[PDB]
Amino acid sequence: ANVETVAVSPTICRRGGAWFASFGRERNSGTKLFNISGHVNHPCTVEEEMSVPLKELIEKHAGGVIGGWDNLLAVIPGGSSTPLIPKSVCETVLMDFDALVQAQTGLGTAAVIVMDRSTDIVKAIARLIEFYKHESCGQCTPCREGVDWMNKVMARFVKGDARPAEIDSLWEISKQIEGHTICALGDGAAWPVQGLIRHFRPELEERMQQFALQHQ
Protein backbone atom coordinates (compact mmCIF):
# COMPACT_ATOMS: atom_id res chain seq x y z
CA ALA A 1 0.00 0.00 0.00
CA ASN A 2 1.20 3.49 -0.87
CA VAL A 3 2.33 5.64 2.06
CA GLU A 4 -0.27 8.32 1.43
CA THR A 5 -2.95 5.60 1.34
CA VAL A 6 -1.67 4.19 4.65
CA ALA A 7 -1.29 7.54 6.41
CA VAL A 8 -4.90 8.69 5.89
CA SER A 9 -6.48 5.48 7.23
CA PRO A 10 -6.26 6.36 10.97
CA THR A 11 -7.84 9.76 10.29
CA ILE A 12 -10.48 8.06 8.13
CA CYS A 13 -11.32 5.65 10.94
CA ARG A 14 -11.45 8.43 13.55
CA ARG A 15 -13.60 10.88 11.57
CA GLY A 16 -15.47 8.11 9.79
CA GLY A 17 -15.81 7.00 6.18
CA ALA A 18 -18.60 9.46 5.45
CA TRP A 19 -16.57 12.58 6.25
CA PHE A 20 -13.89 11.49 3.76
CA ALA A 21 -16.62 10.54 1.27
CA SER A 22 -18.22 13.99 1.07
CA PHE A 23 -15.15 15.56 -0.57
CA GLY A 24 -14.74 15.22 -4.34
CA ARG A 25 -17.06 13.79 -6.97
CA GLU A 26 -18.72 10.41 -6.55
CA ARG A 27 -16.20 7.53 -6.71
CA ASN A 28 -13.42 10.16 -6.49
CA SER A 29 -13.62 10.84 -2.78
CA GLY A 30 -11.38 12.56 -0.27
CA THR A 31 -8.42 14.91 -0.34
CA LYS A 32 -5.20 14.71 -2.31
CA LEU A 33 -1.60 15.89 -2.16
CA PHE A 34 -0.54 17.77 -5.31
CA ASN A 35 3.01 18.58 -6.40
CA ILE A 36 3.08 21.48 -8.86
CA SER A 37 6.43 21.84 -10.63
CA GLY A 38 7.86 23.14 -13.90
CA HIS A 39 6.98 26.53 -15.37
CA VAL A 40 5.01 27.98 -12.47
CA ASN A 41 5.89 30.95 -10.30
CA HIS A 42 5.76 29.07 -6.96
CA PRO A 43 6.34 25.33 -7.40
CA CYS A 44 5.04 23.67 -4.27
CA THR A 45 3.34 20.73 -2.59
CA VAL A 46 -0.19 21.43 -1.37
CA GLU A 47 -3.25 19.58 -0.07
CA GLU A 48 -6.52 20.09 -1.92
CA GLU A 49 -9.89 18.50 -2.55
CA MET A 50 -9.96 15.69 -5.10
CA SER A 51 -12.00 17.09 -8.00
CA VAL A 52 -10.51 20.62 -7.98
CA PRO A 53 -10.07 22.07 -11.50
CA LEU A 54 -6.48 22.11 -12.72
CA LYS A 55 -6.53 25.82 -13.56
CA GLU A 56 -7.82 26.66 -10.07
CA LEU A 57 -5.03 24.60 -8.50
CA ILE A 58 -2.26 26.15 -10.61
CA GLU A 59 -3.40 29.76 -10.27
CA LYS A 60 -4.29 29.52 -6.56
CA HIS A 61 -1.52 27.46 -4.95
CA ALA A 62 1.34 27.57 -7.47
CA GLY A 63 1.02 31.29 -8.23
CA GLY A 64 0.01 30.72 -11.85
CA VAL A 65 1.88 29.87 -15.03
CA ILE A 66 5.16 31.69 -15.64
CA GLY A 67 4.26 34.63 -17.85
CA GLY A 68 0.49 34.30 -17.46
CA TRP A 69 -2.07 31.62 -18.22
CA ASP A 70 -1.99 32.37 -21.96
CA ASN A 71 1.70 31.37 -21.92
CA LEU A 72 0.79 27.77 -21.01
CA LEU A 73 1.77 25.17 -23.60
CA ALA A 74 1.13 21.80 -21.96
CA VAL A 75 0.61 20.06 -18.62
CA ILE A 76 1.48 16.54 -17.50
CA PRO A 77 -1.13 16.12 -14.74
CA GLY A 78 -0.20 12.89 -12.99
CA GLY A 79 3.55 12.35 -13.20
CA SER A 80 5.74 11.31 -16.10
CA SER A 81 3.62 8.24 -16.87
CA THR A 82 0.52 10.20 -17.72
CA PRO A 83 0.03 11.59 -21.25
CA LEU A 84 0.28 15.35 -21.61
CA ILE A 85 -2.74 17.52 -22.41
CA PRO A 86 -2.57 20.85 -24.30
CA LYS A 87 -3.74 24.18 -22.93
CA SER A 88 -7.24 23.93 -24.44
CA VAL A 89 -7.95 20.83 -22.31
CA CYS A 90 -6.30 22.05 -19.10
CA GLU A 91 -8.69 25.02 -18.84
CA THR A 92 -11.74 23.03 -17.67
CA VAL A 93 -10.40 19.59 -16.70
CA LEU A 94 -10.83 18.36 -13.13
CA MET A 95 -8.06 16.65 -11.15
CA ASP A 96 -9.70 13.31 -10.40
CA PHE A 97 -9.34 9.78 -11.77
CA ASP A 98 -12.44 9.70 -13.98
CA ALA A 99 -12.23 13.22 -15.42
CA LEU A 100 -8.57 12.84 -16.39
CA VAL A 101 -9.34 9.42 -17.86
CA GLN A 102 -11.99 11.13 -19.98
CA ALA A 103 -9.31 13.66 -20.98
CA GLN A 104 -7.22 10.78 -22.43
CA THR A 105 -4.79 10.89 -19.50
CA GLY A 106 -4.58 9.83 -15.87
CA LEU A 107 -4.56 11.22 -12.35
CA GLY A 108 -1.44 9.18 -11.60
CA THR A 109 0.47 10.55 -8.63
CA ALA A 110 -1.23 13.97 -9.03
CA ALA A 111 2.14 15.50 -9.97
CA VAL A 112 1.42 18.49 -12.21
CA ILE A 113 4.36 19.40 -14.46
CA VAL A 114 3.67 22.69 -16.26
CA MET A 115 5.39 23.66 -19.52
CA ASP A 116 5.01 27.13 -21.01
CA ARG A 117 5.20 28.12 -24.68
CA SER A 118 8.98 28.53 -24.49
CA THR A 119 9.39 24.79 -23.92
CA ASP A 120 10.81 22.43 -26.53
CA ILE A 121 7.93 19.98 -26.14
CA VAL A 122 9.71 17.24 -28.12
CA LYS A 123 12.87 17.49 -26.00
CA ALA A 124 11.03 17.20 -22.66
CA ILE A 125 9.23 14.02 -23.72
CA ALA A 126 12.52 12.69 -25.12
CA ARG A 127 14.07 13.26 -21.69
CA LEU A 128 11.21 11.34 -20.07
CA ILE A 129 11.75 8.48 -22.54
CA GLU A 130 15.46 8.49 -21.68
CA PHE A 131 14.48 8.24 -18.00
CA TYR A 132 12.36 5.17 -18.77
CA LYS A 133 15.22 3.72 -20.82
CA HIS A 134 17.55 4.08 -17.83
CA GLU A 135 14.98 2.69 -15.36
CA SER A 136 13.83 -0.44 -17.23
CA CYS A 137 14.70 -3.58 -15.28
CA GLY A 138 15.30 -5.42 -18.56
CA GLN A 139 13.39 -8.58 -17.63
CA CYS A 140 10.85 -8.76 -20.47
CA THR A 141 11.46 -8.35 -24.19
CA PRO A 142 8.99 -5.54 -25.06
CA CYS A 143 10.23 -3.12 -22.41
CA ARG A 144 13.91 -4.11 -22.63
CA GLU A 145 14.12 -3.66 -26.40
CA GLY A 146 11.28 -1.31 -27.35
CA VAL A 147 11.88 1.36 -24.72
CA ASP A 148 15.48 1.72 -25.92
CA TRP A 149 14.24 1.69 -29.53
CA MET A 150 11.75 4.47 -28.75
CA ASN A 151 14.49 6.41 -26.97
CA LYS A 152 16.65 6.29 -30.10
CA VAL A 153 13.71 7.31 -32.31
CA MET A 154 12.82 10.21 -30.00
CA ALA A 155 16.44 11.37 -29.88
CA ARG A 156 16.33 11.51 -33.67
CA PHE A 157 12.93 13.24 -33.56
CA VAL A 158 14.39 16.04 -31.43
CA LYS A 159 16.84 16.90 -34.22
CA GLY A 160 14.27 16.27 -36.95
CA ASP A 161 16.47 13.63 -38.63
CA ALA A 162 13.56 11.28 -39.37
CA ARG A 163 10.74 11.23 -41.95
CA PRO A 164 7.05 11.90 -41.16
CA ALA A 165 6.06 8.27 -41.87
CA GLU A 166 8.20 7.17 -38.91
CA ILE A 167 5.78 9.05 -36.64
CA ASP A 168 3.10 6.46 -37.33
CA SER A 169 5.76 3.76 -37.02
CA LEU A 170 6.61 5.11 -33.57
CA TRP A 171 2.94 4.98 -32.59
CA GLU A 172 2.73 1.32 -33.57
CA ILE A 173 5.89 0.56 -31.60
CA SER A 174 4.26 1.98 -28.48
CA LYS A 175 1.17 -0.15 -29.06
CA GLN A 176 3.36 -3.23 -29.37
CA ILE A 177 5.00 -2.45 -26.03
CA GLU A 178 1.76 -1.57 -24.22
CA GLY A 179 -0.13 -4.47 -22.65
CA HIS A 180 2.58 -7.00 -23.53
CA THR A 181 4.86 -6.40 -20.55
CA ILE A 182 5.06 -7.99 -17.10
CA CYS A 183 4.56 -4.66 -15.33
CA ALA A 184 3.23 -1.20 -16.12
CA LEU A 185 6.59 0.47 -16.78
CA GLY A 186 5.95 -0.40 -20.42
CA ASP A 187 2.60 1.39 -20.20
CA GLY A 188 4.35 4.33 -18.56
CA ALA A 189 6.88 4.54 -21.38
CA ALA A 190 4.32 4.14 -24.17
CA TRP A 191 1.79 6.71 -22.89
CA PRO A 192 3.86 9.96 -23.00
CA VAL A 193 4.91 9.22 -26.60
CA GLN A 194 1.27 8.65 -27.51
CA GLY A 195 0.30 11.95 -25.90
CA LEU A 196 3.03 13.82 -27.76
CA ILE A 197 1.99 12.29 -31.09
CA ARG A 198 -1.69 12.94 -30.38
CA HIS A 199 -1.29 16.62 -29.53
CA PHE A 200 1.97 17.81 -31.15
CA ARG A 201 2.31 15.97 -34.46
CA PRO A 202 2.64 19.28 -36.40
CA GLU A 203 5.67 20.19 -34.27
CA LEU A 204 7.38 16.90 -35.16
CA GLU A 205 6.61 17.28 -38.86
CA GLU A 206 7.72 20.92 -38.80
CA ARG A 207 11.05 20.00 -37.18
CA MET A 208 11.58 17.27 -39.77
CA GLN A 209 10.89 19.81 -42.52
CA GLN A 210 13.54 22.14 -41.08
CA PHE A 211 16.10 19.35 -40.82
CA ALA A 212 15.47 18.26 -44.42
CA LEU A 213 15.71 21.88 -45.57
CA GLN A 214 18.97 22.78 -43.84
CA HIS A 215 20.74 19.53 -44.76
CA GLN A 216 19.52 19.78 -48.38
Binding positions for FMN = 2, 5
Tell me, residue by residue from 111 to 150, as one string, x for binding to another protein by CB under 8 A and - for no binding: ----------------------------------------
Residue 4 CB partners (closer than 8 Å, separation 6+): 33
Contacting residue, 166, 187, 203, 205, with another protein by CB under 8 A: 166
The one-letter amino acid at 100: L
Query: Which segment (49-57, 80-88, 158-166, 181-189) binds ligand SF4 by CB under 6 A?
Result: 181-189
Residue 130 CA to residue 87 CA, distance in Å, equals 25
CB-CB contact of 78 with 105 (8 Å): yes
In angstroms, the CA 181 to CA 138 distance is: 11
168 binding partner (options ligand SF4, another protein, none; Cβ < 5 to 8 Å by kind): another protein
Number of Cβ atoms within 10 Å of the Cβ of 133? 19
- 161 makes contact, choosing from ligand SF4, another protein, none, with CB < 5 to 8 Å by partner type, with none
What span, in angstroms and rounded, lies between the C-alpha atoms of 77 and 207? 26
User: Computed over its alpha carbons, how large is the radius of gyration of the chain?
Assistant: 19
Name which of 67 and 179 has its Cβ closer to ligand SF4. Answer: 179
CB of 14 to another protein, least distance (A): 56
Region near ligand SF4 per CB under 6 A, out of 66-74, 119-127, 133-141, 155-163: 133-141
d(CA 16, CA 178): 39
How far is the C-alpha of 126 from the C-alpha of 158, rounded, in Å?
A: 7
CB 78 within 8 A of CB 1: no
The four Cα atoms 90, 27, 4, 139 give a dihedral, to 10 degrees, of -80
In the list 11, 16, 183, 209, the residue contacting ligand SF4 (rule: CB under 6 A) is 183
Q: Which of 136, 148, 178, 193 binds ligand SF4 (CB under 6 A)?
A: 136
Rounded to a whole number of angstroms, the minimum distance from the CB of residue 184 to ligand SF4 is: 7
Among 13, 44, 101, 137, binds ligand SF4 (CB under 6 A): 137
145/161 with CB nearer ligand SF4: 145
* Residues within the interface to ligand SF4 (CB under 6 A): 136-140, 143-144, 181-183, 185-186
